[model samples]
Each structure stands twice: as C-alpha cells, then as structure tokens.
Target: MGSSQPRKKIFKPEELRQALMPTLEALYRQDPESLPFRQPVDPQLLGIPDYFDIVKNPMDLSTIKRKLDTGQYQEPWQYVDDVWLMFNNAWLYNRKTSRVYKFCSKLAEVFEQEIDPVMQSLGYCCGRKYEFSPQTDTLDPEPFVDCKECGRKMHQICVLHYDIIWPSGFVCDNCLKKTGRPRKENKFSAKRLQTTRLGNHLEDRVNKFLRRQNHPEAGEVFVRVVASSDKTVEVKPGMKSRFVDSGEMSESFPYRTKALFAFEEIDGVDVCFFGMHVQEYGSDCPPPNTRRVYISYLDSIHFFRPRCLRTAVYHEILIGYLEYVKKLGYVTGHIWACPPSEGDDYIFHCHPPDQKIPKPKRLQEWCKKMLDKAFAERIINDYKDIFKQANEDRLTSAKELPYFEGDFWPNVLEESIKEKLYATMEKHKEVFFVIHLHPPIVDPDPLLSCDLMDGRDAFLTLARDKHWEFSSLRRSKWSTLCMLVELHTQGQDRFVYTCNECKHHVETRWHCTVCEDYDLCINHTHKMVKW
Candidate 1:
C-alpha cells in the first residue's frame, strides 16, 4: 500500500461543470441561466407557455453520435484538456451525423497568450465587445436565428460611434429590436440621451477623469480605438483609429475587429483606468433600457500581473468568470479574435448562435499550417531540442548538477534549482509554472523497465508515488498548449500549473525547491503522521 497523505479528494463532475459553465454563460450572457438547469430539461415543466417546442430537442445535439462512444457526463472531463477531446468529438460527431463540420482546438491555444493576457491586465471582471461594422447595416444572418426553445428570433446588438473626435458617444442597444423608430421612453431625451452628442466626447470623459481624478498619466494617456465602418473618424492627441477609408470595404473596417484604448505616462509606464457606463432604461424585460452604460470602471484601478497562460488556462478562467456572472441572471457573449498568419487575410470570431458569428476553425488551420511548415523544415524542433539535450547533458552529472540529493533521485523540489527559479518567480507574481516530466507507466514490474524507462528504475514507482503517467510525455504540442489555455481561461488568475499530461492543476501554495532553477515539489523535511 502507498503511504497515506492528507490530500483533498478531487471532484470531476463539479469541476467539469464549474469550468465549462462560465464560458457558456459568457456565450449566452442574456440567458446566462439557460445552462446549469437540470440536463435534458424536464418535458412537463418545459411545456408551459413562453416555451417553444424546440426545447424537445435543444438544437438536435443529442441525435449526434459521439465517436468516443461514451455517454454524457461519463468521461473524466478536464475542461481545458477536454477541449482537444471535444474538438475531435465535434469532428467525429460531424462525421457520424454527416454534419460536415470541423473544430480546431488550436485557436483557443493561441488566444490564451495573444488576447486573454491583455483583457486580464485591463482589470475587467468580464468584457463583452460586439462585432461592430457600420457597413451595409444588415444583420450577418437574416432575421437572426430562433431560440431552440422559444422559436422567437433572438435580438443582437453592437456599439456605434457617431462622432470623429475624442470620447465619441456610444450607443449600446439591440440593433434589431431597438432600431428604426425610437419610442419616447426608449428614445433619446435631452436630459437622458442628449447628454453628449453621438460623437467621441466619451473619450473626453475619460480624459477629464484622467486629469481631474489626479491619475498618474492624467491627460497624457491615449486610446487606440478602431471601427468597422467605411466612414473615417479622426481622434485627437490621445485618440487614434486603426480603420480608415482605404476605398475597399473589405480593406477598410471589416467585421469583428477591435479598437484598443490605452492609458500611458510620458515615461511610458501604462496606467490602468476604472470607469463605469450605466444603463439608461429602468430595467425592463425583452430589451434592458436604452442609451445605457456599456462599460463600468471599478472606482479605482490597481496594477496586477499581465502574464499569459496556456489556452487551456484561458478557457478555465473564462469558465470561472462566466459562472460567477450567471448567478446574477445575465447572458453575455465574447468577441474572440483568433490569431491570423503573416499572409492570411482572414480572421476568426466566436459569438452566440443567435448572432451567427464566425467560428475559429479557419484561423486554427492557418496556424497549424504555419507550425507544420516550421516543423517539417526541422527549424523550431531543432532549436528547442538542442537546448533540451544540452540541459539534460548537464543534469547527467548528478553530484555536479545544481540539485540536492539525500539518497533518492531528487524531485524538482530538491535544493539546487531553488535560487534561479525564485529569481524568475520574483519577476512576475502571476505566472504559469509548467513542469515537463518524462512520463511514468502503471505497471509495477521492475523487470519490464528496459529501453522504454528513460533511465528510471521503474514506471509504477513514479506513477504510484507522484500520480504521473507515461502518456503525458507523448502529448502533442497542441494538447500542451490547451493546458495553458485552461490556465488563463480561469480569469487568467495569478497562479496555475500545467503538466505535459492533460492534468491542469491550480497551485495553492509553493512547495519544495528543486533544480535551483524552478521549485519542483513541496518539502519532505517533515512528514505528517496519522493518529
């Protein structure tokens, strides 16, 4: 029997539900509570008025055959790790049901490092930007898709900028339901809607806050705001626009692009701003008020780490934040910018089903093509491999290597690597400490430990003691990246840990020091004894 340790019991279902619920909430923010209800919703309770027959088959997802052949909620779901599993599931489900669709897990991978890090740094508990475009003014899809349960066409909305100057006025309303003729209550009144003309005056509000509020940069800050409209709008010293009239509508403000706003000082140390944009309506149903506040600043801003995590981390953080908001009865969607290649002209976006927003597959394929090209040429692999081999050669000198050994082969938490790891740790409080280990096997047969053992005496020894698995070492680069995504998705929380294995663990406390470079594990100097 293994030695007993007072370890916490792990709950898979609750964890799976917790991690996935938030992103679902973010996706369907308006009906955030739509998820987390009893699964396969009760037919009798669902048949009441205001409910559509489509609820009988919530989008026909159940008819699709699962390739893994596992029942719902049967498999151990590592939310972030399961994404790769689910992407393959989507492909398999498509093949089985002839849906003819493909899902790429890599898009989420790149998002963690490129996009999520920036949002967390901005101090947004949650940020939802619409797919803005002033071109044509037509809904991307006709009539908007009907709800699977209600059959009513869903309402979609976006932010529109009317002025070309600083602090442009912003309209946060449902484009489909709130457009055309504006009702008195819904219409703009001088005291209510006409507070500021439909221009960039909102930028001035930000500027005034900077100067009047006595913020560090005050008037010195700037915002990089872009729009998806052919009409070019000019911004002053503290304002700039990325989209301009290049003649080509496609070349100009395209759909699903973002406009950035930044605050900085003369010395270039960026400042964080917290402002609030409240809603205009008195909280009614169907549409919630007009000319309302879209963004809210939390009185004061504090500087936190802007470090990025794996894509798996990103999804995990997103899931956590989503669940947090769903409890408040609001539905929300995200405008995810899937990374593009150097030459690729297309971009990918993910929104709610009601909006028919673009998916991330194409961009993911583009990225894979780039990575494959780099791998086939043996360029990246050679460089990374050379570094790994050299580092291992140095470690081969057990005594000379900077590690502590008191009899057994030292785990990462040993004495030597502690200092260097702490130095790196000091640079950034928010970090993802990744431990790439040679995997261990399950069988306890020492006699079987041969060429496959990687110099380890036994596979079961490591597997049993550390809960490490051999398959972890064989994970594809894409899978490893997903683990990082899960880390950041959990609101890009300060501390996270990812294994080469699919196991994504949260770091609660620092343990033992190993490899003077990175702390490997907890200290074993004192062992607890059971009564």
Candidate 2:
C-alpha cells in the first residue's frame, strides 16, 4: 500500500533564529524606551546566564561573602550590573590588577548561583521593604491607631478618620461606613488612599444615588461582560427580578451571582463589555433570572499584567459586583459537564426544552454554537482511544471488523424500504443496525417459510449465537417480522414500536387501523391490550 502523506519538515535551530531575529529587531526599534538599562553599564557587557551553565559551574560562596564586606558596590543596580558582566563576558577580567575587578567577578559568580534559588524560596521575584512589617524608623507614638473592626494596629495615615461615627478613634478603610454613602460626601478627604478605599467610595456613590431614586425595586445593578459582535456600540439590556422575603438583600445577595468583565468589540475595535443583573424587583414576588452562567477560566496574563493595574481593579469590582447581586437574588448559575467557551453566549438565560421556542437570529446562533461545542467535545472524547490505534498503520487489524479508510465504516448496503429513515440517518455520520432483508452478509440459514415468525427466528438465532446485539421480534401489519435495531455506536435507548402501515420499528408509531390519529404512550397502549 502507498505510504501516508509524508509529514512536513520542522524548522532547524539556525533557520528559526534567522526568522526570529528580524522580528526582535523590529520590536526593539518600535519600543526602545521600554527596554531595561543601567547607566555606565555597557549593553554588550550584560549577559543572561542559562540554567545549565549555572548548574555546571558552581560559584565559591566564601569568596563572594568576603567581597560583599569591602563596601565597594554602592548601589544594588551597580552590583547587579557587575554580576551580569562576569557571567556573560567572563574574558574581560584576564590579568586584572584592581581589587574592585576581583570583587565584581566574585559577586557576579555568587548572583548567578543564588538568584534563581533565592527567588524560588521567596515564591516571587520582587519584594517590598514594608509590605509585611512596619518601617524601622518610628519617631512618633500617635501615628499608629488600633482599628475598631479588625483590631489591626494600622498607622493613622493608613486608617480612615471618621469624625461623626467614631470621634476619638479611627477605623480602617474596610470597616468604615459600609451601608450607604456618597463618594463626594465622605467624612475624611484624603488623596492617594488605597484603590480598595476609592472603590468603596465609588460604590457608596452608586448606592446613595439608588436610594434617592424612586425605583428602589430596581435593587443593585451588577455588570458582567462577554464578547460582542463587530457592530456599532449598542447597550442591549435584559432585566429579571423578583420580590423575596423581607430584608433578604440585607444579609447577602441570592443566587451566587457575580460580576464579570470581557474584552470584546463595539465598532469593529476591541472594547470591554459590562453586564448588570438585578435580584429582586417589585412589591410582588415575581420570577428572577435564574439562568446560571458557568465561568471556567480567565486570562490573568492579559488582564493582570504590570501595566494593567486599572484593568485588574475593574476585574476585582466585577467579581465583587456579581457576588453582591447573586446574594440579592437577581440572577442564578448554570454548571455544565464542560466549561463553556468565552465566545459562547447561550448560558446567559435558562432555556428549558419545552420553552425552546424560536428566538432571534443572534440568540439562535449563540445557542447553536454552545450546543455544537458541547456535543462535539463529548462525541470526540468518546471514541478518541479507539481512533488512536485504528488510525495507526502498524497496529494489527482485528478479524471481526475491517479497518476502513475513514474513522467509521462506509455505506455499502442496498437502499432501505423506509426512505425517510434512510434519509435521516444519512444526514449524520451514524451507523444503523439494520435487521432488514438486505443484510451486510447473506443469512447462514435460508428459512423454508417466508412468514414473519420464520424470518424473526432466523435473525434472532444468528445474532444470539454470534453474541451480536439484536432487538426483540414483533409481528407487523405488513406480515413481516420487525424488531428494533440500534447504531453500533451511540445507541439511544428509547421506546420503539412497529408502524401499522410500515413493518419497521420507529420512534413515532401511527396505527391507521383506527381513526383516533392521536399520539399515545406505551403504557396507554398496554392498558388497551389488557382491556
């Protein structure tokens, strides 16, 4: 047999480097200011050591310690620059006379050995001097204040000074005025407070505005975002609400609803989408938007990067907003077998099968994409192992079933008598366990009689002896033996009965013998048989 199509060639190291260098050069030229640099340190002297090199050439720790005591390196950057030069450009120190040069070499050697290991111990590359502990120089006693809510001994500068509620003492920003207040009308007017404090103030502004408004039933608004189509900016709104037990919002929002953000498009340009869902609406207890939206994963690299500080704040707000609204009972959650794609918009609302009426084109498309993704994932995973070996050329083929050119066996059987059934099965890549006259192989035993019972027994015995699957036999109005058969793969175990006009067993059975012409259950049919 002809060999399968030859695999494509992979790029060599040199070839890959040649292709990448141009792109790197272009990027460096585009943003030269962003590159890290140190004054008096030559760019060519700086060299980054690989992991293999550091492991192979271990540094003398004692020599490095002695060099560190000399106080020759004034700044951290200077020490770091000297260290890089030693590692990357080691040949520069041959026949050197100065003690500084020797110290720099030792320092560089120590850094190369210690940098990665030290970072591993700390669990992060960067550290703050006063993050966990207070500043060493403490000149005043009244600078520190004990927070009333958390009891943390925070500095007075860090604590919020609430003159009206707690005059003598100060409260931490987290414990200060939580219920409802305006941002502009806060007690303490200070600049450069924690972002969390600013957010709280903003939330206070929103709550105060809501309280002043007459439509208190609108409750709280929680915004979430999803991908948007390339169109003019549109604020498409959907409202769901219900009245609940008195003071339910006081404790927490109901329905595990939380806020979310999305990077999307408005006018064919990428923008952020904000979503808002409310819990309770009016005086009467109505139905809430009980649709559950399952969130699987998020991209922290894009949203929480160094420059994306504002973006990170918005993300936090979104999460908090969703939690607030969920407790309020405006929305609900829907967990699926698999986490949905970011592009999927179907889970925004609950869609019961009975209520699966025709929707707008956009809504219908969203539902289709979600269902299609879920079904494909399930089906592909089901036969993945089988396909792995079957597709391989070296694997020995089993004698029972022939390995076809494609994933599934091709259709070679003659046309079926039931045109509709044949057409339906043909539409999808599915197998049909046919028990008709035209079998894939000729019957081993040709029955003496052409009656329904004779054909039924012959097929039944053949399948039973070979341990092949076969359905129960039943008499048909066509005087032919009929039984339900399933696709060798993905067999759906549903009720099937012989049609009155046609002999084949189908999901939908119609009895033309009587004029009732109404759909009846198998239980109802059984009752009629007993009567």
Candidate 3:
C-alpha cells in the first residue's frame, strides 16, 4: 500500500518547545502548584510492600505498638496513596468549581478511567480507590432515588443543566430527550438525513471491544452507547424508544443530544457505535449536520505496538460478495437452498444436469498453479479466503444457508480484526505527544483497597472516585461529562473559549467556569472559584 498522509494538524517543534517553556521552568522552580510533592515514607514500622496482599492480614498498624508498649508515639502516618496515585488523582481532585461547567474542565481523565474499566485497566491494574468503604460511609452519602422515571438510570437530571429536551411517553434518557416536535417549536435541530448514530463514539466502542473482557456488563455498556444514536443522543436508561425534544429548535444553531462517551457494558465480542449530534429547531427536525461520533481510543505506547500475525479479513463477505450478489438480484427461494426459477435456471444448472459437477477450472495456467499450491501462497487465494468462500457458496449454495456463509465469516472476522487496531496511526507520530494522560496499565492481581473491603477488580482500582460532598477534595463533574457528550456527537472539541480568549477543554491549563456557563471563554483559575 502507498504511504498515507497524516490526518491530524501539525505544529512546529520550536513553537511547542516555546509553549512548554513556562511549564517546564515552573517545574524547575517548584513542582506545578496543582501538584504538591511529597517525600517517600521512611523508617517504617507498619510497612507493607507494594502489591502485598493484606486482605487476609488487614490489621498492620505500626505506630500503635510504640504508643502501647513504649509509651512514645509519633505524628500521624495516615495512608495517602503512593506518589503515582497522587499524580493520578490530581486532575479529578483539582477542579475550579463545583458547577457542571467547572467539572467539565478538570474531570475528563477521571471519568474516562471510571466508566470503562477495560480502558482503565488495559495493562497492569491496581485496586480502584473509588470503591465505597466504611470510612467513606462515615461521610454522609447522598441519596440516589430509583429513577421513578426510569429505574437504575444515571445521567437523567443532569441533561436539563445544558440542552432543552422533550418527552416521548417518557421512557428513558433516549426516549425522553431525543423526541421533539417540528421546527415550529422554535428550538434548533439538525437536518434529518445527515445525522447518524454509527459515527465516532461507536467506532471507539468497536475498537475497544477486544480489551474489555475483565469488566462486568461490558456488552450492555456497548449497547447503551449504541442506543445513544438511535435517531437522537438523549438516551435514557431503560427504554429503547427515542424521544424528540420540543425545546431543541429555539437556538440559532442546531443543538445536540448526549451520545458521546462509552457505556460501561456490552464490550466483548461485537463492536457498536455511540454518540450522534443533530441540529434541530423547537419541536422540528432539521437535516443532520453530523452523525455517529465514536470515542477516540487513547494513544498508549505499551501493548499497542504493531506486530505481524494472522487475522481474518473483513469487507469481503459483508461488502464485496454481498454487493456482488445483490447486484444480480437473486431472490432467496428456500431456507437451505437457492433453487433457481425457470426464468433463471440457466445460470445455475445449464447443460450439466445429468453429470456430477467437477471442481472449478482455472482460466490461466498461473491461476491453476496458485490454486494447486496452498502453503506458499500469501495473497488471498483469488481475493483471499472470502472470495474462495464466496465461490464455494456459489456452487454449493452455502450462502443460501442460514448460518454458513452469512454469520460464520462475520463472527470469525470480527474476533480477528481487533488485533489490527492501533493506539495511533503512523501518520500521527507528531501529534501523539499532545495526549495529556496515558491510559492506566492494570496489574493483573487485585489491590487490597481500604475503600473496597472485599477488594475490587484490579482495573477498577486505577483511579479515585468522585466525592459527593462539596467539602470533600473530590466532586462530581456532571457538566464536563455533558459537554463531552456534545463533543463526541460532533466529533470535534466544543470548548467555549473565554472573553480573555482562554481555550477550554479538560486539558486546558486553567479555566473560567462562570464565563463558560454564559458560553464565553474567560481567563479564571480554579483557586478563585467555588461551586
């Protein structure tokens, strides 16, 4: 294949170097203010080595012995996570404000890790700090009502914080929010045919399908994201039906529904799509400007390296053969066989009705030589396996069978295709460094977390959880997740630049949430802000 050009934009290395000078100089002077450094624990008594399974031996308090026997105790040695963890939680824990807009600024790394355990634990996984513990229970827990509107649902009330939505018999998030009237409602909507659900987010879900076996409900999570694009983005928890929002048409531009972000379940064998953005007016649907946004897979060096291995070929049976057959307009006559009608019998059983059929004859000596030699052949034996299979199906009528040619090739190819997925395409070598966070590698063994008394699945332990209380160092970023939902639908960054012209996204160095709510981007730091 010819070398392909890079798809991402490029910047001058000198410009990048200049841009990073301030941050590097600040690091040289002192650690980044957001990241306060700490020394290693020393002269330890209650020492447990990293990865030491203390679940069976949970009580290892050392300073207590000095107080009880020696009658001399030292300052408190409260267990903070290792420095690695301190760095991990810095993004989620450090927020400018408690509002949706504020959370949008700082919580991308946090949620991206939280929602998809497979993505979070693609490598060596540690115990999840987010697991609820007795210590956490001591802090007041917030009430989560069973969705009277829809049971076991998350992200319902949060939608009202941004987009104006309507209801369609109010089933779940998808049914309630996407449903809307015609443009007469004065809300903005996208053109109808242009919108699609199988775009970006769904592509990510499909790409990540191979790495999600460790997670429970991976398949269900995939489906929820897939469900997000079933006509609209406001997918509710339970119902499959889509809702049209009456309020979407009021804005000058088309408003989007929430379809971005991978759902945590349905993640194993099959790939699915999630996230679509539609432009609409109040109660009226416009043609979709863009549809089908999949989550972009994170770029990681480890485990994503390319290696040569055998993988099944796709696009053959599904596209090439199917399209070819469709062009012929052959109608299926039976479940097990495709009996040609009298009008078309000549194509199937021309003059050989009395003689047993022979193997296919090659038109050229070179083609015959290739067919005779199977082991030395590297190319698809006549368009490779799919073509050979299609030829077999043609004579034996295998494609006419329910499972043989149809599902078999798709299933086989689906599993084999994952090995071909990559962290970053070769053309993206320059932009790869722009990635802010690396996907956490999970240790196969579980971590003994104080949070999960029983111990969480290894991958679940990589990141910290959101604290419901405002006083707590961690808090929810419902707004950030909402905006990501918007970005995923659009397949582009939707950061609201400030009046001071500060860019906003989870990766922005500083943000102004007050201005963000008004859709203005202004320069403001988290230190000066409060929820």
Task: Give the best candidate by TM-score.
Answer: 3
TM-score of each: 0.15, 0.17, 0.18
Alpha carbon lDDT of each predicted model? 0.25, 0.27, 0.24
The per-candidate count of clashes, in order, stands at: 69, 20, 86
Question: Where does candidate 2 stray beyond 4 Å?
Answer: 1-57, 77-259, 262-333, 337-531
- Per-residue lDDT tens digits for candidate 2, residues 1-531, read 664323222334454334323322332232232132112233245453342343333222222223344444332323333334433333243236544345444544444444434322322221111111121223222233555544434333222232442454554444445624322233211111112222343344344444564342223322222111111111111100111133221212122211222222122222222223211221121222112223322221121112323232333343343343333332332211222233222222111123232334443343334334433533211211222323332333221122111112222211221225323334432111110000111112111121211212333343333222211010010001011111111122233454444455556443432332323333234223211
What's the TM for model 2?
Answer: 0.17
Number of backbone clashes in candidate 3: 86
* Cα lDDT of model 1 by residue, 394-480, tens digit: 432222211111111133223433235334323432211111111211111111111212122222243223222112111111111
> What TM-score does candidate 1 get on C-alpha atoms?
0.15
Model 3 C-alpha lDDT versus the unseen true structure: 0.24
Give the worst 10-residue stretch by lDDT in candidate 2: 472-481
lDDT of 3 by residue, 145-218 (tens): 22223332222222222233232222333323544522122122111112223222233333354344333322
